[PDB]
């Protein structure tokens, strides 16, 4: 478990600087929820270590907070919408005589598609993609140490 | 008895080489060498 | 769906501007039978501003080009009734004449360029 | 069985905070319905354990509650529609001069397609996808502990 | 045979609260019809056991009731439509200057396509999809119990 | 097909609003040769309310904006004949002028915003 | 043969309750036509038996009756159309300023395509699809009863 | 040879009730033509036997009658059209501001495509499709009767 | 860790020259965030070394700063947007009477798709692609040094 | 290391003749950056050497200069745009009643897609494509010198 | 007799290597070694 710092979180994301609209209890609760999507245990032998793990946890917390605060007060009727607001990437938009079309991200399952909803989720996905290079070797024993090779060595 | 874990976009491939033909080449060359020297191969190489 | 605000999510892509908006409260007289109106507490609102692009006319030697602006905002704003109108200024005071789908989730606006703003940090 | 905390549930979702519109008996009924979709037995040897199971159950309850809301006051005329309101992800929509198009999630069966109708369902699907990585090995005996390997070890 | 309870059914679906428009005999008849699509026999060894079975039965009954009540009073002429009202999933719609386009469900046969008609059918399909994971092994005998393995065991 | 209605299935997707609807029965005099109408049993109806969004004008140094609304409903609504039309109110009283495809399966509407509703839970 | 109950038939579908418009002889004739599409012989060893088979027959009768109505009075001018009314699933429709699009059912031959014309046909197709799971094995003898297996058993 | 009954034919299809426009001679001639597309002889061993045979013959006769009678009075000039009126399934139609789009039937040869022209042809196609399940085994002899199996039996 | 020079950073990008709008502490924070994505250890045996590594780090810092600006004051109303501004390549755009369409970059995962949001990200991706040509060979011993080849050489 | 000559650069690209808007310090800095995308080391054995290398470096420097100078003065507000101006090839355009559509270049990675942004990049890509014909043979020894061929030769 | 459960998008692949060719080259080199020492290979290696 990693101790959540409200001051650092507010410094990193100035859009959450308002203490009245964003109480500390909500941030702590969302951090507690987010520590289940990603393990909060830290060891030096992991892939996401220390500050990287902290950054991922903070980004996930911000993503959850934004998605949650979307519903409560947006529809001009206090979220009177029957089914709430559905998230997701917006490929195209149009307002009067202004039109924008964007590039669809390469989502292939629920995790990435959900992460693509908000910029914090996109940044988290990018960081995970960078850190995901390579692979694991789990089972095996050093069998080659028993045979002499090249220059009379066993390494 | 070990397992390697790779990404969905990653791939692995292997290649080999067949060495089941050098025998005839080597032995034919040695037979020709024995033929040049006017000596039976069973003495130069010690075996037919 | 006429549920969740569409202009709310659309503003997350295109990008908007910032205007100062003030609402009307009540009006009185000025011993000339002329109404003088008063507003209250201007605030900051996020909106998208468009063009309809005026062309002028003439009455006699007088050109009188009237300046127009089209504004999209997620506010339940009123242009005219038995009460007064609302005000805004991107750079100069304006007043609008229309309505839109306010009671669901968003509206649309107008604007005619009044003369100037006062100054002193654009009051 | 897992005890359902109504106070903490309303704490999690402020949009359901009204006790007049959402009686506690209705919430208990929906939790009892949702405990059949996902087994609520908790053991340390399950992949879903700890407060993650509570989060999943609460998200499913919220999804069911939102779908229920969509019917009787979603039409708001007593559900006078012949077939009732239908659920599902809305890829495109248009209201007047504003139009937006979103990205279709990768649904492959009834479960994921049904989940993708509301934000809570999407979050539950994402959490399940995160926790679903890996696999199981069921039948097996340690046959490799009978032979001497490498450095005279049996492990 | 499972005893149908009108009171619990009306509690579960408030849109069927009106006793005048929905007599008890009609509900009982539709439950009797629904007990042939899904077997009402119950045993602890079945995949669908417990009150999940009656949940599916109630959902199927509600689906049948909605589809049936569609025809009688739809076209403002007492169902004077020559061929009735056909069911199905509505992919897109438009009323004046409002348009909605939704995601088509993954239907492969008549059963799923029919179930996609109404929200109760969609819920039933989702529940069946969740409970359909795994497989059956029917024939076979424990042949492995006759040989000694690993630590001199026969299990 | 012009058989089973399309508005009924349309309301299963988009989502609607709720209005109170009362019909016209008969008419009498008030010893001034002025008709006064009678309405009976205002029931509850589900309909979709749309956007037409008025602009204002001038008679002479007066403004007089006309408030307008578009409504879609599956009901037989009459706007004018030798009898009188019906009423509604989303928030204030309203009256319409049109017809639509009632004798098959559904109709369409209009509305001009009358002043207010009485109150006491919006009578 | 199976006895056809006119009273119960009219009870099932209230839209056919008028005896003046739908004489009993017409219903009996259509039942006699429908008993050729599906065999009405009842045995405990069939997949379709009992009230399920009865409901199948009644649904087929209702489908035939509705299709007959489309021709007799769908045009209502005495069937004056040169080609006659044609049946089938309506993928899209438009009346004035309202347009609706539906999902195409998966029809693979004449039987399912013809069934999908009316809601009763769709219901019959769905019930047949539910009951159709599984398979048959006809030619066969208990060959495995002549050998001793596992625990000295022949079963 | 099945004897054509005019009274039963007129009872089955009320749209052909008028004797002035549909003389008996024309109906008999069209039945005589239709008894060649489908063999009119009956045996108990045939797949189509009993009332199904006469139902198929009546449907084919009605189809031919409709196709023929469309030609002579269509264009309000006694069929003055140079090439006549062509048949086929109407996928889409539009009259003013009324539009309908239908589902194309799965026709793969001339027979099915022609049958899809009129509702009687569609019903005939459906009946043939239902009755077409299975196959024929024509050549072969009971070889297995000469060997002893299982419990000393030769069956 | 490589020392971050604010002076030369502002020299490189004149658009960030204003110190009041972009305090040095914010720049240091974003550099500390960016050094987690790319390892800042410098050795002569890496693919990225010399000023290439610091150029990559500065470009990543600029990308993060630009996205932060887009979030904080892209809306400029305090980020009162429901989910915040989203990033990505803009395939097409239209403002009034002018429309422009561009070519979609070849993105294959979250990293490249996220990078393509801003010109600095595009430049960083291009430099990484240039430097990425070739490959590695890790486990190996000079087994070819023990034999005599061609001209009596062992090299 | 190739010494940058501002006089030759300004002679080659007259659009950069203005010394006020393009100080020599910026040109030198961009040359120092560009000497890292392409190695500035020169040897006679290299595929690109001498004047070809000089032209490549100059083209890359011009490309970088154009991309950089795009941002600072674009939107008539000193690059007040939140995310800057993105680059890329423009496959279509429209201004009033003038429209042009061009051919998309064959870009397959980030390097080529970035190079296609500006004409200098396109020319650099073309030159590299011309000079990229053929391949390298890195390992091997002259084994054929030990045998006699044709006319008693060992070549 | 053990079953591994995997996801739908998962995949598992196995590789094998063939080692039949080594015997011929080993015996050829040993025969050459015996030839150099001018002693029959039966004495050095115990068998032909």
Automatic annotation (TrEMBL), chains A, D, E, G, H, I, J:
It comes from the Viruses. This is Uncharacterized protein. InterPro entries: DUF4054 (IPR025127). The lineage of its organism: Viruses, Duplodnaviria, Heunggongvirae, Uroviricota, Caudoviricetes. It holds the Pfam family DUF4054.
Automatic annotation (TrEMBL), chains B, K:
It comes from the Viruses. This is Uncharacterized protein. It comes from Pseudomonas phage vB_PaeM_E217. The lineage of its organism: Viruses, Duplodnaviria, Heunggongvirae, Uroviricota, Caudoviricetes.
TrEMBL record, chains C, F:
It holds the Pfam family E217_gp28. This is Virion protein. InterPro entries: Gp28-like. It comes from the Viruses. It comes from Pseudomonas phage vB_PaeM_E217.
